[PDB]
Write a protein that binds this ligand. Structure first.
Ligand SMILES: [Fe+3]
Ligand SMILES: [Fe+3]
Ligand SMILES: [Fe+3]
Ligand SMILES: [Fe+3]
Ligand SMILES: [Fe+3]
Ligand SMILES: [Fe+3]
Ligand SMILES: [Fe+3]
Ligand SMILES: [Fe+3]
Ligand SMILES: [Fe+3]
Ligand SMILES: [Fe+3]
Ligand SMILES: [Fe+3]
Ligand SMILES: [Fe+3]
Ligand SMILES: [Fe+3]
Ligand SMILES: [Fe+3]
Ligand SMILES: [Fe+3]
Ligand SMILES: [Fe+3]
Ligand SMILES: [Fe+3]
Ligand SMILES: [Fe+3]
Ligand SMILES: [Fe+3]
Ligand SMILES: [Fe+3]
Ligand SMILES: [Fe+3]
Ligand SMILES: [Fe+3]
Ligand SMILES: [Fe+3]
Ligand SMILES: [Fe+3]
Ligand SMILES: [Fe+3]
Ligand SMILES: [Fe+3]
Ligand SMILES: [Fe+3]
Ligand SMILES: [Fe+3]
Ligand SMILES: [Fe+3]
Ligand SMILES: [Fe+3]
Ligand SMILES: [Fe+3]
Ligand SMILES: [Fe+3]
Ligand SMILES: [Fe+3]
Ligand SMILES: [Fe+3]
Ligand SMILES: [Fe+3]
Ligand SMILES: [Fe+3]
Ligand SMILES: [Fe+3]
Ligand SMILES: [Fe+3]
Ligand SMILES: [Fe+3]
Ligand SMILES: [Fe+3]
Ligand SMILES: [Fe+3]
Ligand SMILES: [Fe+3]
Ligand SMILES: [Fe+3]
Ligand SMILES: [Fe+3]
Ligand SMILES: [Fe+3]
Ligand SMILES: [Fe+3]
Ligand SMILES: [Fe+3]
Ligand SMILES: [Fe+3]
Ligand SMILES: [Fe+3]
Ligand SMILES: [Fe+3]
Ligand SMILES: [Fe+3]
Lengths: 162, 162, 162, 162, 162, 162
């Protein structure tokens, strides 16, 4: 029993990702209410933000405390352009959640390659939240192709959030 | 009724500060438990982190949604050195909370100078949380000069957090 | 301790304003249900009317009873033209609530200039209700640009009122 | 089935009256507490004010919404002289409530003359509130001829309001 | 962030004032029951005494603990003459509560002049208690001009205290 | 049945003492938290302060109201030096509570000498509170000789106060 430097770096990068995405989603939530007049779209994405800045980063920090791995905090993120409309906004959220699934798959593959079975298990939670969080977002992108009425979409989002 | 660009920038900078401090405190919380074997010191500072990354940044974003001001997300923070022991760790937290009070005082002074009375009011919450958050931290720094026993200090912190 | 005649006049004018607006909103509420077939738009604006004719005017009268200021009742208001459709109706409500914020800012500025700190405090409630009432109205004007279906808008207004 | 222009005007005038009286009573309530040191006399007259500015004007507006009549809002009222003492103050309230009964009797007489039976019924509520509101006021004017002690009168008013 | 010696002295003087007034009101409460046979007048003024010797002085001491200011305890007060009757007794209470409002206004003016925004906020509580406490007293002085019967006045005071 | 001037003076002096001590303890409570970082020591001494400024002075004032004795309010107290550390602080409290017992014994001795049996009884409460209050303080001074750890002492004080 030891501590894989390779897994430590991949998990430090995943920590980095969840902080930076969460800050982007926090901004996107502001825009969804403010500029696009879709307050419940904003609540959906703000909950995504609090999830990414919350248990997604805390589980890695907690995991490090126990296996002997070192936490690194290096965060750089700037929101320099915003998508043009609400549909693109949530389409962009979806693209980044698809990238999460990819990164999560790389960590499982590497944990097995390092015979780090504690780290393969730890990541099983992330293997699923990736699909769960992606479906939630997908359920929302669906709405924008089923209605042209923002208040219809908003009402349907409200019950997803409630 | 309008929108002071000067106040917008000062509040965007305060948003920036509360995100960046919160990420630093999140790291400092990890270290307080992991390296210094003080789990409740870590819980105190993690609650500080969640407060700074939470209502401190959300109130500014919510305030902007109503007065017409623009949110900017530009975050750069790297935790490159850690203090040597728990006392210095919480001493460093204190220094940064003292800097918050200074920044908050500049925004009140400027709001009056701009006759932005909605913004002077908004900041009244921050004028006080600055003193309240500073006292909480001060109560903890006190302990390290009243006992040389980490488990005594930890037990006293626990009831502050409970 | 005394009684600023200047503040007394500005507060008597604000009393005047809240009575006259409330009578206009009472009419606009009637029209929103009667002519535009939007009963919940009418309930939103009738609640605005009862608020302006209620605690907005009573707090000034109560404040005068305590600091020694004289109440004046001079009310002249006639609703001679109505906006063309519901969107313009609530757009017009918004314009007048923006003018409230302006007037409220003048009273805070003057209270400080007169070192009337009891009157600066009294007005802090109005500094915020101005923004709160303006956001409520803004949330409604939003709907008319997000849907072309009056019954969709009405249903969304209903839950704001409920 | 139609819409009597004559009844519409008489009911628009009654709307006008109840708004203007209510604004006068709102002032008289202020004076009864402030200048005459009779806070419960003020509460009695403030409740009269809220009643006149409330269901008295709302029932006409609601009635118009259903029979097809047009609401007019033309309000002019200025409180330029105040009675000399509390007795005269409530004596003056009484005189105006006696004038309400007269106006209400004219509308019933006219509704029958126009065979407007929906409007004769609507006014039956007002035929009685006129007598009820007049008795409440009369019960108060009674007190001022039964005691010369303002605090005795105030205590008796309090239980009428409670 | 620092500590204004000028504000410290003005707040130490306000501490001094609230202790000394409270001791005077404690005596005046004794006299109101003992000599003037008005036990509930005494309870009104004794509650004023406990308020001045209580949260009025404790909030300053608590405020000092947090901003770094020094408490001074220098108290000199002697009750060498008593007013002639109950009316004058409560008239004298009123005069001193009017002087509190004046002193409180000086501290707000000075806090702004020193850009001490934490101290301007702290004093906002006192800006209002000054008016609230003055109205309570004013409500009592009112009674002595509305009745010549001490037991009527006493009964009315009792429900204010209850 | 009469009124002993000698007892009146001794009880007026005891009133004086309990006011002045209470103001000193109020200061000492501030110092115990602020300078010595012992918040619960401060709560112990603040409760002592509220007791001395409360029922200790009120029972004398109430006793005077019934036997015909005259209350005098002559208070002079200045806290010009503070003890060096917490141990001395509570040691000083103890010394003054020992002086209370002495003064209380003089009043009992004098009441018997004057055959003032109502006053001998009144003082029986004080004969015991003197010993009770002295033991509470003694229990605290004990702690400072049983531990050298301020946070241990503080924790033990907390349960005495709770
Ligand atoms: Fe990654
Ligand atoms: Fe979730
Ligand atoms: Fe990056
Ligand atoms: Fe293998
Ligand atoms: Fe998730
Ligand atoms: Fe629907
Ligand atoms: Fe539902
Ligand atoms: Fe539904
Ligand atoms: Fe439903
Ligand atoms: Fe800042
Ligand atoms: Fe907190
Ligand atoms: Fe930076
Ligand atoms: Fe200015
Ligand atoms: Fe905070
Ligand atoms: Fe506990
Ligand atoms: Fe414990
Ligand atoms: Fe416990
Ligand atoms: Fe105005
Ligand atoms: Fe409202
Ligand atoms: Fe006008
Ligand atoms: Fe000035
Ligand atoms: Fe409002
Ligand atoms: Fe519902
Ligand atoms: Fe619904
Ligand atoms: Fe529903
Ligand atoms: Fe009429
Ligand atoms: Fe009624
Ligand atoms: Fe008229
Ligand atoms: Fe006929
Ligand atoms: Fe009525
Ligand atoms: Fe009675
Ligand atoms: Fe009763
Ligand atoms: Fe009764
Ligand atoms: Fe009763
Ligand atoms: Fe003062
Ligand atoms: Fe009070
Ligand atoms: Fe003095
Ligand atoms: Fe300045
Ligand atoms: Fe008070
Ligand atoms: Fe009662
Ligand atoms: Fe009663
Ligand atoms: Fe009663
Ligand atoms: Fe003594
Ligand atoms: Fe006790
Ligand atoms: Fe002395
Ligand atoms: Fe003897
Ligand atoms: Fe005691
Ligand atoms: Fe312990
Ligand atoms: Fe316990
Ligand atoms: Fe315990
Ligand atoms: Fe315990």
């Amino acid at each position: 029993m030891q501590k894989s430097n390779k897994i430590n770096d991949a998990l430090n990068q995943h920590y980095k990702l969840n902080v930076e995405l969460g800050l982007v989603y926090a901004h996107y939530a502001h825009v969804a209410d403010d500029e696009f007049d879709m307050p419940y779209l904003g609540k959906f994405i703000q909950h995504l933000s609090e999830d990414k800045l919350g248990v997604h980063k805390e589980y890695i920090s907690d995991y490090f405390k126990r296996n002997g791995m070192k936490l690194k905090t290096d965060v750089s993120v700037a929101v320099k352009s915003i998508p043009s409309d609400a549909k693109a906004l949530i389409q962009e959220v979806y693209a980044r959640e698809n990238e999460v699934r990819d990164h999560v798959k790389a960590i499982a593959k590497l944990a097995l390659a390092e015979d780090d079975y504690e780290s393969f298990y730890f990541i099983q939670w992330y293997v699923r939240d990736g699909l769960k969080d992606l479906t939630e977002v997908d359920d929302v992108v669906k709405l924008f192709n089923s209605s042209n009425d923002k208040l219809i979409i908003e009402e349907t989002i409200k019950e997803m959030v409630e």
